[PDB]
Short mmCIF file of C-alpha atoms and ligand atoms in Angstrom, two decimals:
data_model
loop_
_atom_site.label_atom_id
_atom_site.label_comp_id
_atom_site.label_asym_id
_atom_site.label_seq_id
_atom_site.Cartn_x
_atom_site.Cartn_y
_atom_site.Cartn_z
CA UNK A 1 -75.95 -12.07 -31.91
CA UNK A 2 -72.84 -14.03 -32.33
CA UNK A 3 -72.56 -17.29 -30.16
CA UNK A 4 -69.20 -18.72 -28.79
CA UNK A 5 -68.53 -22.21 -26.91
CA UNK A 6 -67.84 -21.84 -23.22
CA UNK A 7 -64.11 -23.30 -23.72
CA UNK A 8 -63.28 -20.74 -26.45
CA UNK A 9 -64.80 -18.00 -24.48
CA UNK A 10 -62.41 -18.97 -21.67
CA UNK A 11 -59.51 -18.37 -23.88
CA UNK A 12 -60.51 -14.62 -24.58
CA UNK A 13 -58.12 -12.01 -23.52
CA UNK A 14 -58.18 -10.19 -20.05
CA UNK A 15 -60.07 -7.20 -21.89
CA UNK A 16 -63.16 -9.38 -22.13
CA UNK A 17 -65.64 -9.20 -19.20
CA UNK A 18 -67.72 -12.36 -18.65
CA UNK A 19 -71.26 -12.06 -17.05
CA UNK A 20 -73.09 -15.43 -15.84
CA UNK A 21 -76.76 -15.63 -15.38
CA UNK A 22 -79.33 -18.24 -14.47
CA UNK A 23 -82.95 -19.02 -15.71
CA UNK A 24 -84.77 -20.66 -12.84
CA UNK A 25 -88.03 -21.93 -13.99
CA UNK A 26 -90.84 -24.53 -13.08
CA UNK A 27 -93.88 -26.25 -14.57
CA UNK A 28 -96.85 -24.60 -13.57
CA UNK A 29 -100.28 -26.52 -13.73
CA UNK A 30 -102.20 -23.26 -12.79
CA UNK A 31 -104.92 -21.59 -14.75
CA UNK A 32 -105.19 -17.98 -14.65
CA UNK A 33 -108.95 -17.02 -14.28
CA UNK A 34 -109.36 -20.68 -14.20
CA UNK A 35 -109.22 -20.80 -18.17
CA UNK A 36 -105.70 -19.80 -19.23
CA UNK A 37 -102.95 -22.35 -18.96
CA UNK A 38 -99.67 -20.81 -17.20
CA UNK A 39 -97.59 -23.86 -18.37
CA UNK A 40 -94.31 -22.51 -16.91
CA UNK A 41 -92.99 -19.94 -14.69
CA UNK A 42 -89.60 -18.32 -15.18
CA UNK A 43 -87.90 -15.94 -12.59
CA UNK A 44 -86.55 -12.58 -13.73
CA UNK A 45 -85.74 -9.39 -11.49
CA UNK A 46 -85.68 -5.65 -11.60
CA UNK A 47 -82.16 -4.63 -11.46
CA UNK A 48 -80.57 -1.71 -9.73
CA UNK A 49 -80.52 0.23 -13.19
CA UNK A 50 -84.15 0.00 -13.75
CA UNK A 51 -83.96 -2.88 -16.13
CA UNK A 52 -85.35 -6.64 -16.22
CA UNK A 53 -82.73 -9.40 -16.31
CA UNK A 54 -81.82 -12.82 -14.97
CA UNK A 55 -80.39 -13.30 -11.72
CA UNK A 56 -76.69 -13.35 -11.75
CA UNK A 57 -73.79 -10.77 -12.89
CA UNK A 58 -70.08 -10.54 -13.55
CA UNK A 59 -67.63 -13.06 -12.65
CA UNK A 60 -63.97 -11.99 -11.73
CA UNK A 61 -61.95 -14.83 -13.36
CA UNK A 62 -59.08 -14.10 -11.33
CA UNK A 63 -60.79 -15.60 -8.32
CA UNK A 64 -63.64 -18.05 -9.86
CA UNK A 65 -64.28 -20.28 -12.75
CA UNK A 66 -67.65 -19.34 -14.47
CA UNK A 67 -69.54 -21.81 -12.39
CA UNK A 68 -68.09 -20.96 -9.20
CA UNK A 69 -68.59 -17.07 -9.51
CA UNK A 70 -72.28 -17.90 -11.26
CA UNK A 71 -73.15 -19.05 -7.82
CA UNK A 72 -71.76 -16.19 -5.74
CA UNK A 73 -73.26 -13.59 -8.00
CA UNK A 74 -77.33 -14.44 -8.07
CA UNK A 75 -78.10 -12.59 -5.14
CA UNK A 76 -81.08 -14.83 -4.10
CA UNK A 77 -79.67 -15.45 -0.97
CA UNK A 78 -79.54 -19.21 -1.42
CA UNK A 79 -75.29 -25.49 -7.03
CA UNK A 80 -75.26 -24.70 -10.57
CA UNK A 81 -72.82 -26.41 -12.70
CA UNK A 82 -71.80 -26.98 -16.18
CA UNK A 83 -74.71 -29.49 -16.56
CA UNK A 84 -77.02 -26.54 -16.27
CA UNK A 85 -75.04 -24.51 -19.08
CA UNK A 86 -77.15 -23.60 -21.94
CA UNK A 87 -74.96 -21.08 -24.37
CA UNK A 88 -72.59 -18.14 -24.44
CA UNK A 89 -73.20 -14.90 -26.59
CA UNK A 90 -70.80 -12.14 -27.33
CA UNK A 91 -72.96 -8.85 -26.54
CA UNK A 92 -66.82 -6.30 -24.97
CA UNK A 93 -68.58 -8.70 -22.64
CA UNK A 94 -69.45 -12.27 -23.18
CA UNK A 95 -72.83 -13.19 -21.39
CA UNK A 96 -73.04 -16.96 -20.05
CA UNK A 97 -76.54 -18.39 -19.65
CA UNK A 98 -77.09 -21.30 -17.27
CA UNK A 99 -81.05 -22.71 -16.75
CA UNK A 100 -82.48 -25.16 -13.99
CA UNK A 101 -85.81 -26.59 -13.87
CA UNK A 102 -87.24 -26.58 -10.31
CA UNK A 103 -90.39 -27.87 -8.59
CA UNK A 104 -93.02 -24.84 -8.43
CA UNK A 105 -92.49 -25.28 -4.70
CA UNK A 106 -88.87 -24.84 -5.02
CA UNK A 107 -89.30 -21.93 -7.18
CA UNK A 108 -91.39 -20.29 -4.67
CA UNK A 109 -88.60 -20.79 -2.00
CA UNK A 110 -86.27 -18.93 -4.30
CA UNK A 111 -88.76 -16.02 -4.27
CA UNK A 112 -88.86 -15.94 -0.42
CA UNK A 113 -85.27 -16.53 -0.04
CA UNK A 114 -84.71 -13.58 -2.46
CA UNK A 115 -86.62 -11.05 -0.47
CA UNK A 116 -84.61 -11.97 2.73
CA UNK A 117 -81.31 -11.63 0.69
CA UNK A 118 -78.33 -9.07 1.58
CA UNK A 119 -78.54 -7.95 -2.10
CA UNK A 120 -82.36 -7.25 -1.88
CA UNK A 121 -82.82 -3.38 -2.30
CA UNK A 122 -79.19 -2.95 -3.48
CA UNK A 123 -78.37 -4.46 -6.71
CA UNK A 124 -81.65 -6.33 -6.74
CA UNK A 125 -85.15 -4.42 -6.51
CA UNK A 126 -87.40 -7.64 -6.80
CA UNK A 127 -88.13 -10.73 -8.74
CA UNK A 128 -90.87 -11.10 -11.30
CA UNK A 129 -92.54 -14.25 -12.89
CA UNK A 130 -92.61 -14.33 -16.41
CA UNK A 131 -96.20 -14.68 -17.80
CA UNK A 132 -95.84 -17.12 -20.88
CA UNK A 133 -99.54 -17.02 -21.80
CA UNK A 134 -101.30 -14.87 -24.18
CA UNK A 135 -104.60 -13.39 -23.19
CA UNK A 136 -107.35 -13.14 -25.77
CA UNK A 137 -106.85 -9.47 -26.74
CA UNK A 138 -103.31 -10.94 -28.22
CA UNK A 139 -101.27 -8.56 -26.07
CA UNK A 140 -101.92 -9.42 -22.44
CA UNK A 141 -99.13 -11.73 -20.94
CA UNK A 142 -96.15 -12.72 -22.72
CA UNK A 143 -96.16 -9.74 -25.43
CA UNK A 144 -96.74 -7.07 -23.00
CA UNK A 145 -94.17 -8.67 -20.79
CA UNK A 146 -91.38 -8.52 -23.81
CA UNK A 147 -92.41 -4.72 -24.18
CA UNK A 148 -90.67 -3.90 -20.84
CA UNK A 149 -86.98 -2.83 -20.85
CA UNK A 150 -84.18 -5.40 -20.45
CA UNK A 151 -80.59 -5.36 -19.94
CA UNK A 152 -78.34 -6.18 -22.75
CA UNK A 153 -78.74 -9.94 -23.97
CA UNK A 154 -81.35 -10.96 -21.39
CA UNK A 155 -84.38 -10.59 -23.67
CA UNK A 156 -82.59 -12.44 -26.47
CA UNK A 157 -81.29 -15.22 -23.62
CA UNK A 158 -85.01 -15.71 -22.66
CA UNK A 159 -86.21 -16.25 -26.05
CA UNK A 160 -83.30 -18.53 -26.88
CA UNK A 161 -83.81 -20.39 -23.57
CA UNK A 162 -87.76 -20.83 -24.11
CA UNK A 163 -86.91 -22.29 -27.52
CA UNK A 164 -84.21 -24.70 -26.91
CA UNK A 165 -85.62 -25.98 -23.47
CA UNK A 166 -88.86 -26.86 -25.65
CA UNK A 167 -90.87 -24.77 -23.16
CA UNK A 168 -92.48 -22.81 -26.24
CA UNK A 169 -92.66 -23.52 -30.04
CA UNK A 170 -90.51 -21.17 -32.19
CA UNK A 171 -93.70 -20.04 -33.91
CA UNK A 172 -95.20 -18.76 -30.91
CA UNK A 173 -91.99 -16.93 -29.75
CA UNK A 174 -91.76 -15.26 -33.09
CA UNK A 175 -95.39 -14.21 -32.58
CA UNK A 176 -94.91 -12.90 -29.19
CA UNK A 177 -91.81 -10.65 -30.15
CA UNK A 178 -93.61 -9.35 -33.05
CA UNK A 179 -96.74 -8.55 -30.85
CA UNK A 180 -94.34 -6.60 -28.30
CA UNK A 181 -92.55 -4.68 -30.97
CA UNK A 182 -95.61 -3.50 -32.59
CA UNK A 183 -97.25 -2.45 -29.30
CA UNK A 184 -93.85 -0.46 -28.52
CA UNK A 185 -94.15 1.16 -31.87
CA UNK A 186 -97.94 2.14 -31.60
CA UNK A 187 -97.02 3.57 -27.97
CA UNK A 188 -94.17 5.72 -29.26
CA UNK A 189 -96.34 6.95 -32.12
CA UNK A 190 -98.92 8.19 -29.57
CA UNK A 191 -96.07 10.24 -27.79
CA UNK A 192 -94.45 11.31 -30.95
CA UNK B 1 -105.25 13.19 -18.64
CA UNK B 2 -108.59 14.41 -17.04
CA UNK B 3 -108.77 14.91 -13.35
CA UNK B 4 -111.89 14.61 -11.35
CA UNK B 5 -113.05 14.96 -7.52
CA UNK B 6 -113.71 11.95 -5.52
CA UNK B 7 -117.16 13.01 -4.64
CA UNK B 8 -117.92 13.71 -8.31
CA UNK B 9 -116.41 10.57 -9.71
CA UNK B 10 -118.69 8.77 -7.06
CA UNK B 11 -121.82 10.02 -9.01
CA UNK B 12 -120.81 8.73 -12.36
CA UNK B 13 -123.31 6.20 -14.07
CA UNK B 14 -123.02 2.61 -13.60
CA UNK B 15 -121.32 2.24 -16.83
CA UNK B 16 -118.25 3.73 -15.50
CA UNK B 17 -115.88 1.22 -13.84
CA UNK B 18 -113.74 2.09 -10.67
CA UNK B 19 -110.21 1.26 -10.02
CA UNK B 20 -108.33 1.97 -6.82
CA UNK B 21 -104.43 1.71 -6.10
CA UNK B 22 -101.92 2.36 -3.37
CA UNK B 23 -98.53 3.94 -3.71
CA UNK B 24 -96.64 2.88 -0.74
CA UNK B 25 -93.17 4.26 -0.39
CA UNK B 26 -90.62 5.14 2.35
CA UNK B 27 -87.59 7.17 2.97
CA UNK B 28 -84.48 5.40 1.95
CA UNK B 29 -81.18 6.66 3.34
CA UNK B 30 -79.12 3.97 1.47
CA UNK B 31 -76.36 4.72 -0.84
CA UNK B 32 -76.17 2.46 -4.14
CA UNK B 33 -72.30 1.53 -4.22
CA UNK B 34 -71.80 3.89 -1.41
CA UNK B 35 -72.33 6.89 -3.62
CA UNK B 36 -75.73 7.25 -5.33
CA UNK B 37 -78.50 8.49 -2.84
CA UNK B 38 -81.57 6.54 -3.13
CA UNK B 39 -83.71 8.80 -1.23
CA UNK B 40 -87.05 6.98 -1.42
CA UNK B 41 -88.18 3.47 -2.32
CA UNK B 42 -91.77 2.97 -3.90
CA UNK B 43 -93.37 -0.32 -4.48
CA UNK B 44 -94.71 -1.32 -7.97
CA UNK B 45 -95.58 -5.04 -9.25
CA UNK B 46 -95.71 -7.04 -12.28
CA UNK B 47 -99.29 -7.68 -12.93
CA UNK B 48 -100.70 -10.86 -14.69
CA UNK B 49 -100.84 -8.88 -17.98
CA UNK B 50 -97.23 -8.43 -18.07
CA UNK B 51 -97.49 -4.78 -17.40
CA UNK B 52 -96.08 -2.63 -14.23
CA UNK B 53 -98.64 -1.13 -12.02
CA UNK B 54 -99.60 -0.19 -8.19
CA UNK B 55 -100.94 -2.55 -6.02
CA UNK B 56 -104.68 -2.50 -6.26
CA UNK B 57 -107.67 -3.26 -8.75
CA UNK B 58 -111.29 -2.72 -9.66
CA UNK B 59 -113.61 -1.94 -6.93
CA UNK B 60 -117.33 -3.57 -7.02
CA UNK B 61 -119.20 -0.34 -5.83
CA UNK B 62 -122.32 -2.78 -5.22
CA UNK B 63 -120.45 -4.07 -2.29
CA UNK B 64 -117.61 -1.53 -1.13
CA UNK B 65 -117.03 2.30 -0.80
CA UNK B 66 -113.79 3.24 -2.81
CA UNK B 67 -111.69 2.94 0.42
CA UNK B 68 -113.25 -0.39 1.86
CA UNK B 69 -112.87 -1.81 -1.91
CA UNK B 70 -108.99 -0.56 -2.06
CA UNK B 71 -108.02 -2.38 1.12
CA UNK B 72 -109.51 -5.82 -0.29
CA UNK B 73 -107.83 -5.73 -3.92
CA UNK B 74 -104.22 -4.68 -2.95
CA UNK B 75 -103.25 -8.31 -3.11
CA UNK B 76 -100.43 -7.68 -0.58
CA UNK B 77 -101.72 -10.32 1.83
CA UNK B 78 -101.65 -7.74 4.54
CA UNK B 79 -105.98 0.15 6.64
CA UNK B 80 -105.86 2.88 3.72
CA UNK B 81 -108.43 5.88 4.27
CA UNK B 82 -109.66 9.12 2.68
CA UNK B 83 -106.51 10.52 4.62
CA UNK B 84 -104.18 8.63 2.01
CA UNK B 85 -106.38 9.76 -1.11
CA UNK B 86 -104.38 11.87 -3.72
CA UNK B 87 -106.63 12.14 -6.82
CA UNK B 88 -108.68 10.43 -9.53
CA UNK B 89 -108.12 10.50 -13.06
CA UNK B 90 -110.65 9.49 -16.15
CA UNK B 91 -108.29 6.96 -18.25
CA UNK B 92 -114.87 4.17 -19.25
CA UNK B 93 -112.66 3.79 -16.00
CA UNK B 94 -111.93 6.25 -13.36
CA UNK B 95 -108.33 5.48 -11.63
CA UNK B 96 -108.09 6.46 -7.98
CA UNK B 97 -104.87 7.01 -6.36
CA UNK B 98 -104.08 6.60 -2.70
CA UNK B 99 -100.53 6.96 -1.33
CA UNK B 100 -99.04 6.08 2.37
CA UNK B 101 -95.63 6.79 3.59
CA UNK B 102 -94.16 3.79 5.83
CA UNK B 103 -90.88 3.24 7.54
CA UNK B 104 -88.59 1.35 4.89
CA UNK B 105 -88.54 -1.70 7.64
CA UNK B 106 -92.32 -1.36 7.24
CA UNK B 107 -91.98 -1.42 3.46
CA UNK B 108 -89.69 -4.32 3.54
CA UNK B 109 -92.52 -6.08 5.82
CA UNK B 110 -94.93 -5.36 2.94
CA UNK B 111 -92.61 -7.14 0.42
CA UNK B 112 -92.28 -10.28 2.72
CA UNK B 113 -96.23 -10.10 3.04
CA UNK B 114 -96.64 -10.06 -0.55
CA UNK B 115 -94.53 -13.04 -1.38
CA UNK B 116 -96.59 -15.27 0.98
CA UNK B 117 -100.09 -13.73 -0.39
CA UNK B 118 -103.00 -15.68 -1.95
CA UNK B 119 -102.69 -13.70 -5.08
CA UNK B 120 -98.90 -14.37 -5.54
CA UNK B 121 -98.31 -16.05 -8.95
CA UNK B 122 -101.68 -15.42 -10.14
CA UNK B 123 -102.95 -11.82 -10.59
CA UNK B 124 -99.69 -10.54 -9.02
CA UNK B 125 -96.10 -11.67 -10.42
CA UNK B 126 -93.98 -9.85 -8.20
CA UNK B 127 -93.05 -6.55 -6.34
CA UNK B 128 -90.26 -4.13 -7.55
CA UNK B 129 -88.52 -1.17 -6.08
CA UNK B 130 -88.73 1.84 -8.20
CA UNK B 131 -85.20 3.16 -8.48
CA UNK B 132 -85.64 7.14 -8.11
CA UNK B 133 -81.75 7.95 -8.79
CA UNK B 134 -80.03 8.45 -12.20
CA UNK B 135 -76.75 7.06 -12.81
CA UNK B 136 -73.94 8.92 -14.27
CA UNK B 137 -74.70 7.46 -17.89
CA UNK B 138 -77.95 9.77 -17.56
CA UNK B 139 -80.22 6.43 -18.11
CA UNK B 140 -79.36 4.13 -15.30
CA UNK B 141 -81.97 3.90 -12.70
CA UNK B 142 -85.30 5.82 -13.16
CA UNK B 143 -85.00 6.97 -16.87
CA UNK B 144 -84.75 3.17 -17.62
CA UNK B 145 -87.35 2.19 -15.34
CA UNK B 146 -89.81 4.64 -16.89
CA UNK B 147 -88.99 2.80 -20.21
CA UNK B 148 -90.68 -0.42 -19.14
CA UNK B 149 -94.35 -1.18 -19.90
CA UNK B 150 -97.00 0.22 -17.44
CA UNK B 151 -100.96 -0.37 -17.31
CA UNK B 152 -102.84 2.57 -18.19
CA UNK B 153 -102.63 5.58 -15.78
CA UNK B 154 -99.88 3.89 -13.73
CA UNK B 155 -97.02 5.74 -15.28
CA UNK B 156 -98.81 8.99 -15.19
CA UNK B 157 -99.99 8.47 -11.57
CA UNK B 158 -96.27 7.60 -10.36
CA UNK B 159 -95.05 10.86 -11.71
CA UNK B 160 -97.94 12.75 -10.32
CA UNK B 161 -97.48 11.47 -6.99
CA UNK B 162 -93.62 11.97 -6.79
CA UNK B 163 -94.50 15.67 -7.62
CA UNK B 164 -97.41 16.26 -5.35
CA UNK B 165 -95.70 14.27 -2.55
CA UNK B 166 -92.64 16.62 -2.85
CA UNK B 167 -90.38 13.45 -3.45
CA UNK B 168 -88.77 14.72 -6.41
CA UNK B 169 -88.44 18.26 -8.24
CA UNK B 170 -90.81 18.56 -11.22
CA UNK B 171 -87.85 19.45 -13.46
CA UNK B 172 -86.29 16.19 -12.46
CA UNK B 173 -89.49 14.34 -13.51
CA UNK B 174 -89.55 15.95 -16.82
CA UNK B 175 -85.92 15.05 -17.37
CA UNK B 176 -86.45 11.59 -16.33
CA UNK B 177 -89.46 11.06 -18.71
CA UNK B 178 -87.69 12.67 -21.63
CA UNK B 179 -84.78 10.58 -21.12
CA UNK B 180 -87.20 7.35 -20.95
CA UNK B 181 -88.62 8.20 -24.14
CA UNK B 182 -85.73 9.06 -26.21
CA UNK B 183 -84.11 5.63 -25.08
CA UNK B 184 -87.39 3.94 -26.14
CA UNK B 185 -87.33 5.85 -29.59
CA UNK B 186 -83.59 4.85 -30.21
CA UNK B 187 -84.24 1.17 -29.28
CA UNK B 188 -86.95 0.88 -31.71
CA UNK B 189 -84.94 2.83 -34.28
CA UNK B 190 -82.56 -0.35 -34.10
CA UNK B 191 -85.45 -2.90 -34.59
CA UNK B 192 -87.07 -0.64 -37.45
CL1 CL C 201 -108.31 -13.23 -21.57
CL1 CL C 202 -73.24 5.40 -11.81
#
């Protein structure tokens, strides 16, 4: 999945569309069932098209910079800047990823704001927290989560961000994705 | 997937576990992008194990009837009865399904209550609305939704309930599931 610099992406022809998305996350000192460390909580959402993705959407560059556009397309009813920028990937779409660490209290505030948003029940069908832990059965939690259906680029963006923000070791991300994919294969083999 | 009567399920040995779940839904006169009829909204949720399911959980029959247990395990921070019962299926677990039509306003109230619940961010990671429409590309909406990962029995329960409550024609449910499964197959073929 080709990476491109923000400033080079901005020079692409008018035939290129730009999407901007935000990964909002918080340290989570919670312990599921009092024994499984949650470590972090990340917000994703169910989109109108039945896929999981990050808050955000397409930015009309006739009106807005990437950052000004981002803040207007989050749909969370709620100021991200270049300081929050992570990377851009070619998917004729360039997908721009931003990330911001909040307190867990602030992350909950976003969830509350979201349910009261104007976009709730239209383009956004509900927020979900990503489980980053893996249960003893080696599938419950993050591997199962990664076996859901994601909008183009979002799954790759999630895994990229977890790595580069030092939220999970690369080895554990590789394992979780392998477990997810094996699960999908086995499930499809039962059906076919 | 074997069906069993409620009263026969109640006679099963102590080696059988019982789960009770609720499908809360409302008529939705909304039109996505002003052209796609939404028809109904149904609530599901992201569980702690990274799978989509209905609100509910295991009922300890040493303490509660199926109905008394159901109302205590919803996790929505909020009275379902035998009148709301739909069916029971053998999955060593019997999965009991209940359903209740609310106003859209009441359905939104449940979403608000849920984000403020004691279980939010523990066993429940967020509610989502099911998109029952299909976009012009024949995958956006319900087929994509059905391509997510579901906890045992939930996907079958959803499709069963949509049929028997006359919310979607059987032909359209069959089509949506076929589209979902073909999508999963094609996606897995790209990876392998
Ligand atoms: Cl576990
Ligand atoms: Cl469409």
